[PDB]
Amino acid sequence: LIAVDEKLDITTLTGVPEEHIKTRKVRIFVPARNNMQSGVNNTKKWKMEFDTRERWENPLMGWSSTADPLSNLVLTFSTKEDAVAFAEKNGWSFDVEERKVPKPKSKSYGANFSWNKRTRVSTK
Amino acid sequence: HPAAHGVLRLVMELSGEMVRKCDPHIGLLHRGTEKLIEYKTYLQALPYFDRLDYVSMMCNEQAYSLAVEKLLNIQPPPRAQWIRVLFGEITRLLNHIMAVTTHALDIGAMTPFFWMFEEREKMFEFYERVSGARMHAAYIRPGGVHQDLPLGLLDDIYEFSKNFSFRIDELEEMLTNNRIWRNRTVDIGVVTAEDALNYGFSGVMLRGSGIQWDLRKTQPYDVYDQVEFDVPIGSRGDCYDRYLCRVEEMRQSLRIISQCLNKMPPGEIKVDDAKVSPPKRAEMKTSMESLIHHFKLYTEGYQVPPGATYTAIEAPKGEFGVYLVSDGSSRPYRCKIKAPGFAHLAGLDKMSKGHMLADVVAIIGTQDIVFGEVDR
Amino acid sequence: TRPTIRPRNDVVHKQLSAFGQYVAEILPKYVQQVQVSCFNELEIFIHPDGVIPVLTFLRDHTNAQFKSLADLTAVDVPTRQNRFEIVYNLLSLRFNSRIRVKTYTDELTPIESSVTVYKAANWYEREIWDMFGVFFANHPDLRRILTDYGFEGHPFRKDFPLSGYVELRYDDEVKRVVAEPVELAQEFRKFDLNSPWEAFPAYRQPPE
Amino acid sequence: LKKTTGLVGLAVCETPHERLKILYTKILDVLGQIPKNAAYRKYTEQITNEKLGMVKAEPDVKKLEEQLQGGQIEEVILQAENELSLARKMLRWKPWEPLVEEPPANQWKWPI
Amino acid sequence: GVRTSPTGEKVTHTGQAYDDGDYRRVRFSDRQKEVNENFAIDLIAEQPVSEVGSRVISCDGGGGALGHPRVYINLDKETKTGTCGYCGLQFRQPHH
Amino acid sequence: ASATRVIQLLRNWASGRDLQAKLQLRYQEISKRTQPPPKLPVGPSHKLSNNYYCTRDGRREAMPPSIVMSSQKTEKKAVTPAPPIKRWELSKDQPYL
Amino acid sequence: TSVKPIFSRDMNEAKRRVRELYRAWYREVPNTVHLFQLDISVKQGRDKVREMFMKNAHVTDPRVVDLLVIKGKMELEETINVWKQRTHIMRFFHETEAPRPTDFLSKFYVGHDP
Amino acid sequence: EDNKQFFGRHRWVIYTTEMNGRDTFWDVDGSMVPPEWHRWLHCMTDDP
Amino acid sequence: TYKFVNMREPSMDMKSVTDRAAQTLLWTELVRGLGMTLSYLFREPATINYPFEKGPLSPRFRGEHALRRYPSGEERCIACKLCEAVCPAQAITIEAEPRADGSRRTTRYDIDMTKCIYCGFCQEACPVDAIVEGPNFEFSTETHEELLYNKEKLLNNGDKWEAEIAANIQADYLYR
Amino acid sequence: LHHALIPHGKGGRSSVSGIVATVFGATGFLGRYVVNHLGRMGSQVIVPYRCEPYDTMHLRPMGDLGQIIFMEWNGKDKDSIRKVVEHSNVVINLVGREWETKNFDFEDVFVKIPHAIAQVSKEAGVEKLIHISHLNADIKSPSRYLRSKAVGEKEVRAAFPEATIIKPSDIFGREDRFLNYFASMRWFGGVPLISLGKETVKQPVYIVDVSKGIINAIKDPDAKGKTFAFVGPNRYLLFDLVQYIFAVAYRPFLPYPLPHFAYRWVGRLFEVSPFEPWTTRDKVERVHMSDMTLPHLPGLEDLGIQATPLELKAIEVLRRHRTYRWLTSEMEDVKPAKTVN
Ligand SMILES: CCCCCCCCCCCCCCCCCC(=O)OC[C@H](COP(=O)([O-])OCC[N+](C)(C)C)OC(=O)CCCCCCCCCCCCCCCCC
Ligand SMILES: CCCCCCCC/C=C\CCCCCCCC(=O)O[C@H](COC(=O)CCCCCCC/C=C/CCCCCCCC)COP(=O)(O)OCCN
Ligand SMILES: NC(=O)C1=CN([C@@H]2O[C@H](COP(=O)(O)OP(=O)(O)OC[C@H]3O[C@@H](n4cnc5c(N)ncnc54)[C@H](OP(=O)(O)O)[C@@H]3O)[C@@H](O)[C@H]2O)C=CC1
Ligand SMILES: CN(C)C(=N)NC(=N)N
Ligand code: SF4
Ligand code: SF4
Ligand SMILES: [Zn+2]
């Protein structure tokens, strides 16, 4: 076994083009809960995604064109540290967003019928 | 090249016409099927399995369906299983006709190609009647089969199966005892049993080498434990013995087809679980639960419990396997496809040792490689 | 009865568990874990440098005659330190059984080639190298098998785009096929399908 | 006595009992060089003594193949040779030692 | 009910018509523009309004399992007809 | 089929079989292209009672694999992955071709 | 830490392997130009070999250098065996790609790319 | 129609010599058949 | 059970040896193969007289696509995008908006017939039987652009093929 | 700008360059190169053709779906000219022939057709016109070809005052006449040269440089009403140039003098061909004529193009003319010819 003290760097081995290594900033984040639903199962894992590039309209058929290979590329990580290590070894720039969790709340059904407080509801 | 099946680049070193080495170059039909399957859902990835070995299509579909059902922990109904076995044997007949006649065409005979391809045309008519597609049916699905048989299909399959042994007999009249065919095929591409096992051969390769192994008998799936058939075993381990094994497998497939026709049961054809298999159109247009489940199944799909499985079946070309990895989502995390012809083509160089150019053509034919499944 | 539920085989489950304990006892140096999935599949997780000893044992031992290599593949999990997971599927004809052996590695760590144990490992490891970038140490002929000549990158890695980076066309000025950066007339439309509600409680992870 | 084994490249052995006795004795001799507490040694010694006792008690070849349940006597001889080679390699590898190294914290966690 | 743009180009049922200065009209030169003549909006307006003497009616589009999912329409608002929104069919209660 | 008696005899003699018994061209022996309407069955879960999905839920009975042994965590007889495969019996229908 | 060495235990052995591969690639350019019937000069081929070697000059990991020389050897053997075609050899030169602007003002005029 | 012929050859069409505005005396397509006779000719039904 | 495909040994009686010697010197099996080919020569060919004769097809056949209408003439498609979701090949492009009468109707409905794999999932997933895969299979073109259908082309296909499409759906809708 | 003419993309096959160009004479040498460059950058190209559509098939792969459009036109038909230039903002004129057929003369192909194209384009509202002339376009030239070029250049300038008139010297490429005309003379024994080719100086230009300059003239906003001269870097005597051509082709070069009247008679003999003639009297005159020097006119450097020397691209054209003995010889195996600079 040999001892080498370097930061891991595999950009020369991944085969990505230089522009797509150097001009790309990924976003490491936990997805925000879709406000149209009350489920919280899509807010468990961290995601890594790239910055949006240009999309234009095809002259024929009017479809949506692109020239960005990394437009649909989304990676799933279990931890912020794992995502950051992956981004660092692949050489991309990255912006990390701290996870937002709902704060604990005090819910009381009996509060709907307060004798002197404004929490008394006018209808059920 | 006519004998290269279209997308094989065989870089050969020849001393005169003697082959010094075979260096197969594949990837000329590599598409990225596994990456695409990662991007699709479980229903959307089924035609990919239709198009891998495009001669045993319902067989590839059946392997994929068995894998997904194993991970889902469900069970197809008996009528669905019997339809699956019947069409797997029909598909085996299609594949063996193709293999034997294309092998003979590479050797130099063409009339058996034409006769047995008329038979292939009739079996294509059966495929088109059940599915609407002549070859890429997408009929066998996780949970059973897509639709039920029309009301004359069993009678027509009976007529075909009744008249097919004579076609096999006529094919054998031109090749089996022909001295030119025997000179071309006898003691060509001999492979020992230990070498076959180490190189990873499966199916008629092993059985020509003399190994008594068949997945339909040893590790049965669907209703293969309720049918009677024999497993042909070769002795010399060469092209002639593998040809005999394939012809006798055609006859045993006729046996299994007769038993399936007689033992076809009544009932539904897909699992009665609307969270996995779609409801009927009338129920969808009448029931709220059925409409919801139709919507969700055809937009998102069903979630498969996390886990990895390797399921193999005895496809006409050998053991065809799927290693499927699910992460609990509606899209497969990983899907490795193990094609029988990959290992056989890997072993082509050893088999063609000490032979000539025409012998190498014969050895390619006896290995019976489809590069759709070799490359994926 | 339960017509729509797959029946289980506790006898085979017990046999596989017993053999897993057997192997784990015989090879303490390398075997890290043994599992039996509930559809009766035995899985042995070993240290990456016990590949040759464990495979040779599973091939040559009298009570484990796994003479056939059904498959050899890898799985890419970017969230792990050792992202690549090498999977060996073995078949025992003598005992009519199948086993799985799992190993881990990363980009820069080689795995010993098993062509000295199974001959199918040759093309299987060539494909693993070509598609994932895993290097196999003592391989007779390690080169690309499926990708185009001069293709850069390993397409089966999770961080590789689906359509790649370059595409081919014929250029009349130079009278040859050329490679130019990829550019799609209609971009692949990425669908978000996952439901925000939990499907299987039995696999629920601790909140941590 | 039999014309063929039915397997390509596997030849009929004229003296199966003597060859099996030689191979099993050699296997047991190689196993004596392995540590006594090794789980490998106890198991394969047990099965070798079990097989060696049958070859010394049944002089009929068909009955011996029936008792061994190893297929054919040539397959049994080939498997004995494979076991001997494995015993030598295991003596070289020494797999009875404690675990080389534990995996990272979450190396087998799934799904993830 | 097809209509013609000021440039002579037919207007589709979605209102599509290339501008006068749009270069993309060159593709139709020495060729034609594919336009379907029947307009579904016009045909469904031509359909008459059915009158039924119940507060709630059901429409499946006709044909049963060959139509659309069966839906129920509430005919209580007297200032408008209840429209089946799968097939665009109008229903009403007998007034006066 | 439509053939002269001479031609049929010559065909039979040349091939050594009775071709008229097994013909490869289909003459009115196949099913009609128009069939009566079907009425397919429903299935086992189409009852109005005693039919709760939790009692017939295959996917929810899937479990994570059982950990037989983990490093992290008498004379035993040696075992095998399964009982040895039985020797195959030669076919009674036609043992040899 | 104590990582497994693939081929080289130190950066000097990796440099030695790089030099050997450079000699091999340098001595094969005349044969490649002759066999593939390329219209480029031998000097152009050697300049391309140097340029391809020199874009990895920032690497300081012996394992990455070992992998780079392994891949270079593989693509040298693809050229020698004429497995590659003239298409790939000329793909090394990008003779059909338009000159991409590199200054801020030109990029600003062309479009939205950074 | 001729039911005495084998299946596939028991129904056939003689194309017109002038369809729409094309002189179809020699150049005859398989797409000249209107859909109802298309169904009858391809044998999706037994009723003309 | 199993059987041996080649495990028989020839009889060594003088009659059998002479018969084999005659077969070697007088090419008996070769003449037998000649007889088989001659028998096929005097059989009837299996060739149909295309394009005047067509091969058999079924109501389930999947050919060219079509967008259907209700008997009133109203389009069946309600722009629900289930076909776009289920399409394996991503060959359908759909864009919708409220119509002038407030209907949920499509403004764009494209199918790339060079991307379509003719699998029939779109007509399984359609809840209103709008998109169907009709019986037409002879629609080869001379340019690539002619194979990129749009809403006008698909509605024209439905109007042209509606009779046969209706008949096939009537014949096969009880199996669905 | 119209919203559909705004550039979008990265200048690739599936991008939008905002160029709608009608390329007359695209079914030829310079035409195929110009169409390739336009479609490569991702433009809309209209190809008017009078030939059999089979001869336009090599232009089909040059652009993405719908970007190449083929329309049938007649040279003497202003209605067809309007039909093809109606929707385009660039019109490129590459129509010309090196011989006179029964129906079209040098006056027809070089004066009448260019004037009609320029006049119809101005009526139709076409923003840019590019017109290809010849470098030696002299009204007093011995060659009827070049006299027609001069007259047509004047007519085009009058009809479309905002034109870009480009004057290439002698384009050489794979499908050219120049190098193939000189290299195909090996069949007729020796090489006949007027004054032994010692009184002729030529600087040929490369086809890719010509097409790149044509493309850059479209994109240049300050080349609207201008005249350019497209010439190569090096001037050669005709004897040295032909000797180098034969050296690169590895053919035995046996030049002999031929008097001008005899060469004219030979050229008259070859122009009775109903098909494409091998050589003509005007071709002989143009070959003998030295290339003019026009230092006042702008050039490839002014359009941003570095002219490619003949010594770098001659082996592309002349390797086809080698024998099997010499096919594999490399580019640097032949010493460059002496230049006259
Ligand atoms: C060599 C054989 C001699 C015996 C011949 C016996 C009769 C042969 C009968 C079969 C004819 C085969 C040809 C069929 C096609 C008909 C068209 C055809 O032939 O076209 C030919 C060529 C056709 O040219 P092409 O090469 O463009 O033709 C290609 C074919 N097309 C275009 C038809 C598709 O026609 C001509 O050359 C005629 C035009 C006038 C040419 C004047 C040439 C002058 C003489 C040549 C030498 C001059 C230098 C001498 C130097 C020394 C002087 C002292
Ligand atoms: C009174 C005393 C008279 C003395 C004379 C006695 C002679 C009569 C008896 C002997 C005659 C023997 C016949 C001679 C021909 C035999 C040729 C032969 O050698 O047979 C075959 C060789 O022949 C062939 O194999 C033929 C292959 C090609 C066949 C393809 C076409 C043949 C089919 C068409 C039939 C031909 C009909 C001929 C008609 C002629 C009309 C003019 C043996 O080769 P193998 O089986 O491979 O084994 C040898 C080593 N173990
Ligand atoms: N290449 C050179 O050496 C030089 C050329 N030029 C000029 O550049 C232009 C292009 O040159 P080049 O590529 O070599 O020429 P080509 O002969 O190869 O191509 C000429 C083009 O014009 C078309 N054409 C010719 N006559 C007519 C006509 N009467 N009506 C309609 N179309 C016609 C031809 O079409 P079709 O095949 O359908 O008949 C073809 O597309 C010409 O104007 C030429 O004079 C200037 C300097 C040097
Ligand atoms: C090209 N394909 C599919 C073949 N089967 N080819 C062949 N030569 N047998
Ligand atoms: S048939 Fe299949 S591939 Fe074609 S449009 Fe329908 S769903 Fe998509
Ligand atoms: S599934 Fe049917 S109704 Fe829904 S968008 Fe598609 S064609 Fe329209
Ligand atoms: Zn309705």
Coordinates of C-alpha atoms and ligand atoms in Angstrom, one line a residue, chain B residues 47 51, chain I residues 62-63 65 82-84 86-92 109-113 115-123 125 131 133, ligand 5:
Chain B
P47 CA -40.6 -3.5 -25.7
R51 CA -36.2 -6.0 -29.3
Chain I
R62 CA -51.6 -1.7 -35.2
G63 CA -50.8 0.4 -38.3
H65 CA -52.4 6.4 -36.1
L82 CA -52.0 10.0 -20.7
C83 CA -50.7 8.8 -24.1
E84 CA -47.8 11.2 -23.9
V86 CA -47.2 6.2 -21.4
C87 CA -45.5 6.5 -24.8
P88 CA -42.3 4.4 -24.5
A89 CA -40.5 6.2 -27.4
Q90 CA -41.5 9.8 -26.4
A91 CA -43.1 10.2 -29.8
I92 CA -46.2 12.2 -28.8
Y109 CA -50.9 17.0 -31.1
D110 CA -47.8 15.6 -32.8
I111 CA -46.6 12.1 -33.3
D112 CA -43.1 11.5 -34.8
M113 CA -43.7 8.3 -36.8
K115 CA -39.7 7.7 -33.4
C116 CA -42.9 5.7 -32.8
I117 CA -42.4 2.0 -32.1
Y118 CA -46.0 1.1 -33.0
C119 CA -46.6 -0.6 -29.6
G120 CA -50.2 0.5 -29.1
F121 CA -49.8 1.7 -25.6
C122 CA -51.4 5.1 -26.4
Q123 CA -54.7 3.5 -27.4
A125 CA -54.0 4.4 -22.1
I131 CA -56.0 8.1 -30.4
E133 CA -53.6 2.8 -34.3
Ligands
SF4_5 S1 -47.7 3.1 -30.5 FE1 -46.3 3.2 -28.7 S2 -44.5 4.3 -29.5 FE2 -46.2 4.7 -31.0 S3 -47.1 6.7 -30.3 FE3 -48.3 5.0 -29.3 S4 -47.4 4.7 -27.3 FE4 -45.9 5.9 -28.5

